Amino acid sequence: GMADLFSTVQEKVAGKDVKIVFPEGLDERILEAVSKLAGNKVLNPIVIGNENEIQAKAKELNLTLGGVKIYDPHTYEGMEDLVQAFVERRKGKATEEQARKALLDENYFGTMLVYKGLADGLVSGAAHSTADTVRPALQIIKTKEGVKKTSGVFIMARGEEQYVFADCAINIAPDSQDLAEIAIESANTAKMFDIEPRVAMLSFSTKGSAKSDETEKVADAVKIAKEKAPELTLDGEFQFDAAFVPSVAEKKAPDSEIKGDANVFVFPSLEAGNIGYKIAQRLGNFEAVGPILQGLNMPVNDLSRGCNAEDVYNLALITAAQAL
Amino acid sequence: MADLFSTVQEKVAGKDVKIVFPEGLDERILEAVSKLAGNKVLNPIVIGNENEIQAKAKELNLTLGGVKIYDPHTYEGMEDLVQAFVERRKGKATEEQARKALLDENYFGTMLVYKGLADGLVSGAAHSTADTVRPALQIIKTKEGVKKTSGVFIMARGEEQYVFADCAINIAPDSQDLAEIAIESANTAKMFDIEPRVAMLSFSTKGSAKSDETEKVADAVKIAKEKAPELTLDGEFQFDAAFVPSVAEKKAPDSEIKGDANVFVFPSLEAGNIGYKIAQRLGNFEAVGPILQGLNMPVNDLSRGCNAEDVYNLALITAAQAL
């Protein structure tokens, strides 16, 4: 179901020697995933932490660290160069002593590595707050060309059915400019899973039903998006009905690009987005793939604390894909 | 879900409850009204021109058995209704204004419900949801300690039965509103024989994220719990924590709700509307249309382009609210 969706991603990744950093080097979820990722030669994992400590941990887990490189921030050669690169990136917001201290942190150390090409993407989260990962991601690595913010999408899958849900994790109260962006970026992220983008901007009314600030926010969001990205198939201010079921599409709003065949649903607020994917998961019995960030210069992703060893493996597959 | 209605029809049938249907020339209502009277479930009152309705029912192969017809241009108590309206409008309406206002199906029918000539109204099949709720709030009003109405939905799939908090009326509810939506929704759940277990939803569980949005709800929980002690409801849950027990003891134990909520209060209209719909179209749950709550007398809004049976069930629900 969701599983063959990953085999499609692993297809694209495997054999390209993509390097992904895993800052939580002592976490068995990461060690197991890393150990196996290297074993099958899918990608080249880099782990951060004390080499002896990790080596011994891997052993009590009956693991081996085959094609796995280990970097210790208290040993790395290029630290001084990294320290210097960081201060330059922080534009004076960081002294040298600050930089040095900052980079002794797993997540920061690993983010700098991805920033300076020593790694292609980072994957942390199994033992940190979601902020502790996205923070450096935004201070060091930044958002792409015309992107101002990151968003968290979720791949929803149930059998043949595959959808993308727009920012159900990062941005709390997105505005018109934000939504339009969430929609454009989510549409591109869906390309990575070989989905043909058909965006629908959700709200509690369809193209006019109710007229309040909240509906106009999204309506405006559609203008912005359509203007900024003409070719992308997306119409806006739909209720889930109109966006998901065709009968309702021609009734509530015909003449619209979307004909009840939306496969990318942009939610109006984090409250809708979060409760949304969760209701779809627990009630609709859809498989839900955890937050996937988007719009950054280099791939960075947040695993769920208390996640799964296979969850670590797949995020890596997705993160590597974003890099390719 | 269908058996959920038989539970309501159980309570209603035989009590001679009178419900007004302002849209007298709508076949959805005529078919529903014709059938309700046919089974002697409730006593339907229809508004409009008698010859005109009588003739329309004829082209639908319907009879208007136990169905009373009121015409605003003929009703004998108009004068008294007009006067009662001006009094209720506390001077906001002149006499000429009231007279005109009451020639309107919805207003006329609302007045009947207000003066006891009917027990509840059911409109919406051919008017905006605003056009129904307007007079309901101008004439009839909210109960004792209620300030606003809320639109709940009954969600049903097989054995599963839940209530969804205001997915239709209030756009941007605040702490006081949410607490209310919760107490009222919980009561409305009693009507369907559901044992209330409210969960105030958000994007974080008892602390996860701290922003205005989470506090708004957290505050809502205080208000509600203080205002209504005995009601089992804990707050600021993510759908996980509220629906699946495994997630309850992890994200937040010691809480009254143990992943067994059956009344879900949404933080905003964007969340609630998108919510019940995703639950319906994706979760394959049966969703009964907006059911208003908290008013002095039952009033409900059908969806334009609804179903004849939809009208029939909304009447069952509205009659129940009157009992």
Side-chain angles (χ1 to χ4, degrees):
Chain A
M2 167 67 88
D4 37 29
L5 182 52
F6 279 135
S7 309
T8 309
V9 178
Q10 187 165 316
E11 154 62 46
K12 316 189 169 202
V13 170
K16 278 69 192 71
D17 296 302
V18 186
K19 309 132 173 288
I20 274 83
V21 195
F22 300 75
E24 290 132 340
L26 244 27
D27 199 81
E28 48 213 79
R29 268 83 65 58
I30 292 282
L31 293 186
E32 282 179 42
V34 144
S35 170
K36 183 177 179 170
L37 276 168
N40 312 336
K41 305 192 76 178
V42 179
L43 44 84
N44 305 324
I46 302 170
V47 138
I48 295 170
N50 184 77
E51 182 145 68
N52 281 3
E53 210 171 1
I54 286 165
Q55 222 85 58
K57 188 54 168 294
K59 176 204 282 295
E60 71 164 338
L61 303 178
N62 272 339
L63 294 167
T64 277
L65 295 172
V68 194
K69 192 170 308 312
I70 308 302
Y71 288 166
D72 188 330
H74 292 118
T75 279
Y76 193 67
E77 248 318 81
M79 240 311 187
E80 142 192 57
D81 286 344
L82 282 177
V83 163
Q84 214 55 61
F86 183 59
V87 326
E88 258 177 59
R89 186 52 154 171
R90 296 295 292 146
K91 300 176 187 180
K93 297 181 168 184
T95 57
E96 201 184 67
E97 16 280 301
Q98 298 188 309
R100 207 177 316 293
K101 177 191 179 179
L103 302 193
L104 284 194
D105 172 84
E106 302 157 38
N107 279 298
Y108 271 77
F109 184 55
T111 315
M112 271 309 267
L113 286 176
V114 173
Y115 182 54
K116 301 299 286 189
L118 286 152
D120 313 308
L122 177 152
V123 166
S124 193
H128 296 275
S129 69
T130 301
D132 279 7
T133 287
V134 62
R135 169 103 43 57
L138 291 177
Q139 287 185 357
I140 327 296
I141 316 280
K142 289 181 176 183
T143 43
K144 272 183 297 178
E145 191 63 70
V147 190
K148 317 162 201 64
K149 303 184 184 181
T150 345
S151 9
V153 321
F154 278 61
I155 314 306
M156 305 300 282
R158 180 225 266 161
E160 214 69 275
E161 278 167 290
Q162 296 173 171
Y163 312 128
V164 177
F165 279 18
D167 205 351
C168 317
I170 308 296
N171 190 317
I172 295 85
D175 64 47
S176 301
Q177 264 307 323
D178 296 333
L179 283 304
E181 178 165 273
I182 302 181
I184 271 65
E185 231 54 53
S186 292
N188 180 259
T189 296
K191 291 270 196 61
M192 189 177 88
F193 295 81
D194 293 340
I195 291 176
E196 203 49 60
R198 284 190 253 104
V199 187
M201 313 288 286
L202 307 174
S203 185
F204 56 66
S205 87
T206 311
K207 305 195 77 61
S209 297
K211 246 236 184 160
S212 53
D213 296 308
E214 289 81 356
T215 68
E216 239 51 62
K217 171 188 58 191
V218 175
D220 285 342
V222 186
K223 287 283 185 179
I224 321 279
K226 273 184 166 177
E227 208 285 350
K228 214 280 129 59
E231 8 57 87
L232 190 270
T233 311
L234 98 67
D235 203 302
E237 185 202 353
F238 280 20
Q239 280 175 301
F240 202 61
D241 302 299
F244 198 60
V245 12
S247 311
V248 186
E250 73 182 311
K251 237 293 157 55
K252 249 80 173 289
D255 294 77
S256 169
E257 274 177 291
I258 291 170
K259 303 208 177 306
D261 65 345
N263 61 181
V264 173
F265 307 73
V266 182
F267 291 66
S269 76
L270 178 65
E271 295 191 301
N274 197 265
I275 306 177
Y277 99 78
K278 291 186 175 301
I279 279 170
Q281 163 178 58
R282 275 61 173 66
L283 287 198
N285 298 304
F286 268 77
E287 302 180 63
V289 159
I292 285 110
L293 295 181
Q294 57 186 184
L296 302 173
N297 289 310
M298 284 100 119
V300 169
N301 274 297
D302 177 69
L303 288 167
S304 187
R305 217 120 53 157
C307 64
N308 186 290
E310 188 202 352
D311 280 326
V312 185
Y313 180 107
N314 302 311
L315 234 206
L317 286 180
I318 276 155
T319 307
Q322 293 190 293
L324 293 172
Chain B
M1 166 70 95
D3 36 21
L4 182 52
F5 277 139
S6 302
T7 309
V8 183
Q9 189 168 313
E10 155 65 45
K11 316 193 173 194
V12 173
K15 284 66 192 69
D16 297 306
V17 183
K18 310 127 170 288
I19 279 153
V20 197
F21 301 75
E23 291 134 339
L25 250 24
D26 197 83
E27 44 213 77
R28 270 78 67 65
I29 290 187
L30 291 183
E31 275 180 47
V33 149
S34 169
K35 182 177 185 171
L36 282 167
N39 315 335
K40 302 197 73 180
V41 177
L42 45 85
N43 303 326
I45 299 166
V46 127
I47 309 293
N49 186 84
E50 184 148 65
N51 286 338
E52 215 179 357
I53 274 97
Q54 222 87 66
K56 187 56 169 293
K58 185 191 281 288
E59 72 163 335
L60 303 173
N61 281 335
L62 301 163
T63 279
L64 296 176
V67 189
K68 195 172 307 313
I69 302 182
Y70 286 170
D71 187 328
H73 294 101
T74 272
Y75 192 64
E76 303 89 337
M78 240 313 155
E79 157 183 46
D80 287 343
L81 287 177
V82 167
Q83 214 55 60
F85 181 65
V86 332
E87 271 176 48
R88 184 60 151 166
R89 292 298 288 157
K90 300 178 185 178
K92 294 180 177 179
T94 59
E95 200 184 71
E96 19 277 303
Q97 304 187 313
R99 203 177 316 292
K100 168 183 180 182
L102 300 193
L103 282 191
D104 171 281
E105 304 158 40
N106 279 296
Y107 272 75
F108 182 60
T110 311
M111 276 312 274
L112 294 172
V113 172
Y114 182 55
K115 301 298 293 184
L117 290 152
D119 310 318
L121 176 150
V122 166
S123 187
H127 300 267
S128 70
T129 297
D131 280 2
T132 294
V133 60
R134 172 102 45 57
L137 293 175
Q138 287 185 1
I139 319 180
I140 318 281
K141 289 178 170 185
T142 42
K143 272 181 298 179
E144 192 64 65
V146 186
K147 316 161 200 66
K148 304 185 182 183
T149 350
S150 17
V152 323
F153 281 68
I154 306 74
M155 308 299 281
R157 181 229 263 164
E159 210 70 276
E160 285 167 284
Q161 297 175 176
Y162 315 127
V163 183
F164 278 24
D166 207 352
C167 315
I169 291 51
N170 194 319
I171 300 156
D174 65 43
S175 303
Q176 264 304 322
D177 297 331
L178 284 299
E180 179 164 86
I181 308 292
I183 274 68
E184 232 53 50
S185 295
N187 187 254
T188 297
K190 292 268 193 59
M191 194 174 89
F192 296 79
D193 291 339
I194 288 173
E195 200 52 62
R197 276 183 260 122
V198 187
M200 316 283 289
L201 308 176
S202 181
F203 55 67
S204 81
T205 314
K206 305 195 78 58
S208 295
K210 248 231 187 161
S211 53
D212 297 312
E213 290 82 356
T214 68
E215 237 53 60
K216 173 189 60 186
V217 179
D219 286 348
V221 187
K222 291 281 187 178
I223 310 165
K225 273 187 158 180
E226 205 283 349
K227 212 283 124 60
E230 12 53 83
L231 192 269
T232 309
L233 98 69
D234 206 306
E236 187 202 2
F237 280 22
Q238 281 176 299
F239 202 60
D240 308 293
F243 199 61
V244 19
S246 308
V247 193
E249 75 185 310
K250 234 292 158 54
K251 250 78 173 292
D254 289 74
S255 168
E256 274 180 291
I257 295 291
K258 306 209 168 307
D260 62 339
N262 59 182
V263 171
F264 307 69
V265 180
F266 292 69
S268 72
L269 183 63
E270 298 188 300
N273 192 268
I274 304 177
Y276 101 78
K277 289 182 179 303
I278 289 175
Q280 163 181 58
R281 276 56 174 62
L282 285 199
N284 302 296
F285 266 79
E286 303 180 69
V288 188
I291 303 290
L292 294 178
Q293 56 187 185
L295 306 170
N296 288 311
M297 283 102 125
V299 170
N300 274 300
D301 176 73
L302 287 165
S303 177
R304 219 116 49 150
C306 56
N307 182 287
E309 191 204 353
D310 276 323
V311 186
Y312 182 103
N313 299 312
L314 229 209
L316 286 179
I317 279 156
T318 308
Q321 293 193 293
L323 293 171

